Design goal:
part of a larger assembly, 10 chains, B: about 270 residues, mainly beta, Jelly Rolls, 13 strands, about 5% helix, globular, D: about 70 residues, little secondary structure, Rhinovirus 14, subunit 4, two-stranded antiparallel sheet, elongated, binds guanosine-5'-monophosphate, binds myristic acid, binds calcium ion, Genome polyprotein (chains C, H)
Chain lengths: ~240, ~270, ~280, ~70, ~240, ~60, ~70, ~280, ~240, ~70
């Protein structure tokens, strides 16, 4: 008998261990593998896919296709077309996007977020919006003259339907907590009118734009955690 | 180039040809193109039947109509073609069938309309049944509509009693009738027909399955779904309507296991 | 020695005034947005060392998740013989945590690591004496005869793989090959177990539709091997699955609403995933 | 029959470079005849986000008109 | 003491383990091995041996030699001489053939099945039968004009007594379940008269043919399971 | 490193019209039937990798 | 005295070819003096179905008349 | 083979009468005194072999220190369900020994070795029978759903790392990477979790100031997996932390007075570290 | 199974063990390390830093800044300006200096101690003190003519504010116990006036000097022990 | 993949020189894929007391006037 001596952890069962276990089905001639379209290697690949945001999950709109449709019109206001807080896994609206759902299986996240908008008005409607990401620390941008003072882009509606506005990873810590936390503040993404959507004779005076969110190639997430997004009634039994 | 627009495009298969002067490129599902079963991946040992032109062409389904009320539509491959010319015959005379397709969704309006259709091609498109008295309770007849395909609604009212209303899909639009927010239906090969931008959608899709070839009469690999991400709209009436046409074309079709023809239950 | 691939670093950029507009695009194509910091603002040079090392499917599925909890009771009372054993149907739908994750992909292929945790206790005031318990987990593949009583010939296991645990010892565990009879594991299945022909019920199929109607991995017949004692004893066995050496295909959205049954099925009771937000302009 | 490999850079570890010392080597000796019994397959950080973020036929480059 | 740490599975007894155990009888001078005729290396070798099928295990015929004898006669009908469902381990008739018995110790199976028939009529009797395997999916072949539309062979009775008809492995899944299952449908093997057995003056007007089943060299079975085919009264004891 | 013996692969074949009849035999000899797909129908080429690795007496 | 050998191709494993990487090697070191104590003998897929399916004296080939 | 660095040896020296005065200096500069034996008296030659081998931070922090003691009770009585489990907040402030040491440095960076010691006993005279206990320690990172009851779906741990101990076996233990979301662990933090803007309470901040207001490592949800027995049983689990592969920056004076709360805070009750000495000339 | 045999110590938990434990968070992409000012490698580094001594922790002075201030004046006495017993971790006054606090985490210590004094009088004040370390063994130096007979240095107040007096490691044992012990006697550090601080017209006639203590590069400490210097009320619980 | 190293001179050991015999060698074989799981990092006796005892800009040498 080779003199051995057991150490702490001996006999425990850590659900994150990576050990060799004997095989209950020896010499099993596995099934010949074949090539299947669209394999996936990393969850982050999915996190880069452009998903739809429920920007307008307001009462009467929530939990209905209508929530994905952002309101836009002919009239000229100086009011935010929308306001979103940069917290990929927290915010009630973002937490449910593909990006969000994934972030929610991890504890920390880093990277730049890509906000892409598709104006769905009539071809005949013109207009210039202004998308903006203002990093945390000051009075949240309620008006345009304040959002314009931070990271922004003046999107001109035209043949190029879509337009992206990126949220350059600007943070103090290298990683941000997925759960909502003040220390790990994200910032403020808003929108305004640079001018005003303008339509002509016989043209739908009100329409929408779709807002998508995706992660940039510098994006990574870490520390596998369980997701809050799903519940389950304590299982029956048989006693 | 001589002005080779990304918008203009022609497609040809068999004796059929699509054209479109306003498309937005075309996408090839998961980046792979239709292929045949390679001697190293084969399973059935009988010599396959490869119809080629006789069946790998452009079959056009009965158009549907986009209304301000329209909630969405859906279909199933190969199902929604089981009656399409020669393709069908081969499909039904054989136990095993394999195929990929080129989906072309058409829908023209005018520079004065608004609207945006999300054309998604979902693999293994399983929807929930309409009856909370049973599970996975759907009749073959209802699951396989064919050229007609189904439609999405925005309400969920299961018939726990009436067992003839349970045996059908609960096409809940904001959840793909699957229990997943449609907002993320984009993790599937797709295109968006935004009226102010394009009027066509072209999505080429390769066979997808945990097997090389399968039994078509039992299984629908793909599911085509179209949801108005942006409601149709016209300055004139408050009841605008525009036709949406779906033309599908199978490719690299091959079948194994030939016998008497299959004729499923019907009404 | 090798260097793991890091996530895109940020190369320093500056102004611009060209006809090159990385900002604009046309998502109608079906292509996601591509822009990155450099394309929109003036960036500095940043050397990124971080890696998506933890989002690797193998890491993402690298945990022994509890899939079910079986119960059984070794009693000496009248109708406590059928209680002396239990039969569990192999699957991951019994719970929702692991299920949801796998459910991220249409198809998957992997080897499996089974781990079992036993926990016995006393039911009523029959808090007396009972020797140490020795359990048996027998895997009964589709087609193999199933136990009638907690002790009929079937527990011989001359071919069925069986574990024998001696309560108090390390949680028994074992490995299983990718046994699927397909080239991959099918997570969903838009089809029927068979084709209903011309002359049949106008409802045929409602019974055999859904992945559940075609999938079958057999069952786990658990039991205590000891005989019945004076005092009745109750044991709870928990099954843990960790898919390893994995790979998956075709991504799909995550399950957004509560799970009803083994299929997709939803319940009108809970189908409002999201949450009302004061206003569209409420930060 | 043992196979040595690089560990996962830890706390006070090699500059991320994972190229500093043999003190970052772990040994592995498979004990069973069936592959299934082996530890987690080696970390693979390869990836092709494009089959999902850009499965478009004609390729378009950022700087150009998405719709030409 | 060499620092060790026990892991899950430690101390368990898996009936499918393959480990080294000490020998209770050390230095046992085994018995010199000699060559014995007919050794066997693999169960599948046996699965290729031609066994007899109880095609006609009908009431009054079952569990008696008579069940192996398939009825044939002078008269001309358009009725199936027999009908068998392709399920090697399931079907009451096949499950008991050598091929079947073996398949029944495993969970999955793949390969082509060889159905060989030996016409035992009188030398003087002629005739042309039609054997056929129709893969699953459609109306089961009740008449000839339907069986003829699938895989078939027109067997001409003659000097060559026997005739084989193969069931080419045609399946959707790569392996079929041994237990009866709808997903893993096998297909339909039937038989008919191409013409009609014809005998002359003073010739037995009715006879039989023997049906054998065996596996082809592309045949394999996997996942060792216990067999249902045998029972055993819970053993006595001594208490 | 070595490669376990796989079960017969299927080589592609086609029609026929010869005096070679693999279909017929005479099991009286005591020899089992030998025919295989190729002998009876038109087959495609199939590379078989599967092995009777589990029917080995030692596994059984 | 250890002897390394090839494992049994598993799930996400070498193309059936079992000729890809040393990551499919398992080590074996017999510990007892008596062979009987050893693990299962190495998988042997050899076979001669003919001693059972064709132990006929004069050999006959498919394509010919079984009875000449 | 190599030779560990020894502490300065003493080289022999003698008298002196130079303008070189190693004795005098000017600590105003901020530089400590430097003189050594040689500079002041006549020394002999001494070969020093001794080494500060034990003051190496890794040695100084090389111990599994107890950080907290959790309690929980598996009872079958009315309100003894919430007792069937417990949730501990991860931190080292629960005690003072280890805390003080780490507290020697402003910042630190390390890997962590968790070790757990379980000790069960009988409360009242319910000194009856109870089978062997199997506990579960589940790490619930910030953001993950927390257990409602000692047995709601959360204990599946499809992603959360969980240990399963079988009382009587070796003290379970495990390792944890440096998980800080900073480049180092911050031991102190002269700041607020967020910036209170113009129009707010004239007191805003009093709630979110101090390292404690920004730090968060999640919690340990412990529990016994067995069901409730006749007799109630009480268990005490002790958490042990040993920071390994460590390195720290910026030294600070040691905590001189009793600790109040998690912050620096002192208590007027005990803030007299030192001790009266008879006289300044009392040896 | 490789024949093993457990040995004493098997399964124990020694808080000073150094073993390999499995990682609960596999493949955790740690946070990129960066350079931080003032790292520290050894506690002894700190032990060399000059800290302030509470020389005058007399009643009314203890636990107050005033305790660090050593009394000095114009008058000429022959009395000790102070008296300290050489016991780095014991003595109520030293035990609390950085050097002390550290020594208190260890059991043994060796090395030379550096006593540095900073005269804070007025520039105009002159004077010559006499610092001295008398190794143990004889009558403690009460007067100057006795302290002068041991290791000493005549410090002349001048432009060079500070002046160090070293306590050459002179011991019988190679290491001294940190706790107070007679065997491990340290010796006596005192101070006197060589002449007398002298000030002129309009010059503060009384002032102080600060006394610092630090360790020399030949100093080392060993045997990690817990420190007495901190207390903690038995923790609550929850029972 | 094992790495041998020098032990810590014990009782009746090599003259402090730690350069006497292979009897002062201990072997180490990391078993886990994650560095964090490793034993205490090797004893490092390096040190720079000056960043604390003399972080003065202009350097002064003992024998000279601290204040020139
Ligand atoms: N932005 C920019 N453009 C310049 C400058 N000097 C010349 N240009 C013109 O702008 C073009 C594009 O350079 P820029 O880096 O966008 C150059 O090819 C040149 O014609 C300069 O300092 N800044
Ligand atoms: N089956 C077949 N036989 C052919 C063909 N052309 C000629 N033959 C004749 O059929 C013989 C056998 O060829 P088959 O492949 O059975 C040939 O040697 C030739 O005499 C053909 O296209 N098909
Ligand atoms: N201390 C000392 N100084 C001496 C002696 N002989 C000469 N000196 C003078 O003192 C200077 C310094 O030498 P000491 O070692 O301090 C010499 O350069 C020389 O001018 C002697 O024996 N002792
Ligand atoms: C002795 C224990 C035997 C356990 C046998 C389990 C059979 C594994 C079937 C695979 C189950 C997971 C696959 C899936 O449902 O996706
Ligand atoms: C299964 C057990 C998981 C334990 C997870 C503990 C997380 C470690 C956080 C670091 C705590 C010490 C750092 C500090 O406060 O300085
Ligand atoms: C390659 O394997 C050569 C190195 C062998 C070192 C011995 C490892 C310990 C034994 C491995 C398990 C053997 C089981 C029979
Ligand atoms: C060949 O055996 C050389 C490799 C040896 C490696 C050590 C394996 C562990 C010891 C084997 C058992 C010895 C029992 C006395
Ligand atoms: C380098 O590692 C070569 C020496 C190998 C000697 C065998 C050591 C025992 C096995 C180490 C643990 C392997 C775990 C799979
Ligand atoms: Ca990079
Ligand atoms: Ca082959
Ligand atoms: Ca020295």
């Amino acid at each position: 008998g080779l003199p051995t001596m057991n150490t702490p952890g001996s006999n425990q069962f850590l659900t994150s261990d990576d050990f060799q276990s004997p095989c209950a089905l020896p010499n099993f001639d596995v099934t010949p593998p074949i090539h299947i379209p669209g394999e996936v290697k990393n969850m982050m690949e999915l996190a880069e896919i452009d998903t739809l945001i429920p920007m307008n999950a307001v009462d009467g709109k929530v939990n209905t296709m209508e929530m994905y449709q952002i309101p836009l019109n002919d009239n000229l206001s100086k009011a935010p077309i929308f306001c979103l807080s940069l917290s990929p896994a927290s915010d009630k609206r973002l937490s449910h996007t593909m990006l969000g759902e994934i972030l929610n299986y991890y504890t920390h996240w880093t990277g730049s977020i890509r906000f892409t908008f598709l104006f769905c008005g009539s071809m005949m409607a013109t207009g210039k919006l202004l998308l903006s990401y203002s990093p945390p620390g000051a009075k949240p941008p309620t008006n345009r003259k304040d959002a314009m003072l931070g990271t922004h882009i003046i999107w001109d509606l035209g043949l190029q339907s879509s337009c992206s506005m990126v949220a350059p990873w600007i943070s103090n810590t290298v990683y941000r907590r997925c759960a909502r936390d003040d220390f790990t503040e994200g910032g403020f993404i808003t929108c305004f009118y640079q001018t005003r959507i303008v339509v002509p004779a016989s043209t739908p005076t009100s329409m929408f734009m779709l807002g998508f969110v995706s992660a940039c190639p510098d994006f990574s997430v870490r520390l596998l955690k369980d997701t809050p997004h799903i519940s389950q009634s304590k299982l029956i039994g048989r006693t | 180039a001589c002005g080779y627009s990304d918008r203009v495009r022609q497609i040809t298969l068999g004796n059929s040809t699509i054209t479109t002067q306003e498309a937005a490129n075309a996408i090839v599902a998961y980046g792979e193109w239709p292929t045949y079963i390679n001697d190293s991946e084969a399973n059935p040992v009988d010599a396959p039947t490869e119809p080629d032109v006789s069946s790998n062409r452009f079959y056009t389904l009965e158009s549907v109509s986009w209304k301000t009320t329209s909630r969405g539509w859906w279909w199933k491959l190969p199902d929604c073609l089981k009656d399409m010319g020669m393709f069908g015959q081969n499909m039904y005379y054989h136990y095993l069938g394999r195929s990929g397709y080129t989906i072309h969704v058409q829908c023209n309006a005018s520079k004065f309309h608004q609207g945006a259709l999300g054309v998604f091609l979902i693999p293994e498109f399983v929807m929930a049944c309409n009856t909370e008295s049973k599970t996975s309770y759907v009749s073959y007849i209802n699951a396989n509509p064919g050229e007609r395909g189904g439609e999405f609604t925005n309400t969920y009212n299961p018939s726990n009693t009436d067992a003839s209303e349970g045996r059908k899909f609960a096409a809940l639009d904001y959840l793909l009738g699957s229990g997943v927010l449609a907002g993320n239906a984009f993790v599937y090969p797709h295109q968006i027909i935004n009226l102010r931008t394009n009027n066509s959608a072209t999505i080429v899709v390769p066979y997808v399955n945990s097997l090389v070839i399968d039994c078509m009469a039992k299984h629908n690999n793909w599911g085509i779904v179209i949801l108005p991400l942006a409601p149709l709209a016209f300055a004139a009436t408050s009841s605008p309507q525009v036709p949406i046409t779906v033309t599908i074309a199978p490719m690299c079709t091959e079948f194994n296991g030939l016998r008497n023809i299959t004729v499923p239950v019907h009404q | 020695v090798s260097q793991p691939p890091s996530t895109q670093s940020t190369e320093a950029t500056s102004g611009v005034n060209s006809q090159e507009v990385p900002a604009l695009t046309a998502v109608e194509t079906g292509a996601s947005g591509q822009a990155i910091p450099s394309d929109v603002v003036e960036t500095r040079h940043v050397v990124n060392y971080k890696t998506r090392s933890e989002s690797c499917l193998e890491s993402f599925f690298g945990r022994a998740a509890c899939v079910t909890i079986l119960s059984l009771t070794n009693s000496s009372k009248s109708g406590e013989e059928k209680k002396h054993f239990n039969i569990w149907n192999i699957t991951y739908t019994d719970t929702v945590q692991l299920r949801r994750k796998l459910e991220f992909f249409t198809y998957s292929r992997f080897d499996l690591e089974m781990t079992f945790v036993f926990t016995e206790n006393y039911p009523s005031t029959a808090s007396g004496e009972v020797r140490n318990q020795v359990y048996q987990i027998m895997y009964i593949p589709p087609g193999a005869p199933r136990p009638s009583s907690w002790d009929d010939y079937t527990w011989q296991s001359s071919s069925n793989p069986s574990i024998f645990y001696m309560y108090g010892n390390a949680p028994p565990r074992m490995s299983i090959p990718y046994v699927g009879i397909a080239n991959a594991y099918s997570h969903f299945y838009d089809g029927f177990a068979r084709v209903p022909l011309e002359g049949e019920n106008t409802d045929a199929g409602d019974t055999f539709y859904g992945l559940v109607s075609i999938n079958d991995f057999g069952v786990l017949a658990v039991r205590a091997v000891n005989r019945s004692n004076p005092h009745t004893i109750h044991t709870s066995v928990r099954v843990y699955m960790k898919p390893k050496h994995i790979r998956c295909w075709c991504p799909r959205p995550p399950r957004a609403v509560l799970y009803r049954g083994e299929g997709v099925d939803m319940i009108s009771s809970a189908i409002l995933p999201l949450t009302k937000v004061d206003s569209i302009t409420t930060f | 029959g043992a196979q040595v490999s690089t560990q996962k850079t830890g706390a006070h570890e090699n500059q991320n470079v994972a190229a500093n010392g043999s003190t970052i080597n772990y040994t592995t000796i498979n004990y069973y005849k069936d592959s299934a019994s082996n530890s987690a397959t080696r970390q693979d950080l390869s990836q092709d986000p494009s089959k999902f973020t850009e499965p478009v036929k004609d390729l378009m480059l950022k700087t150009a008109p998405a719709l030409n």
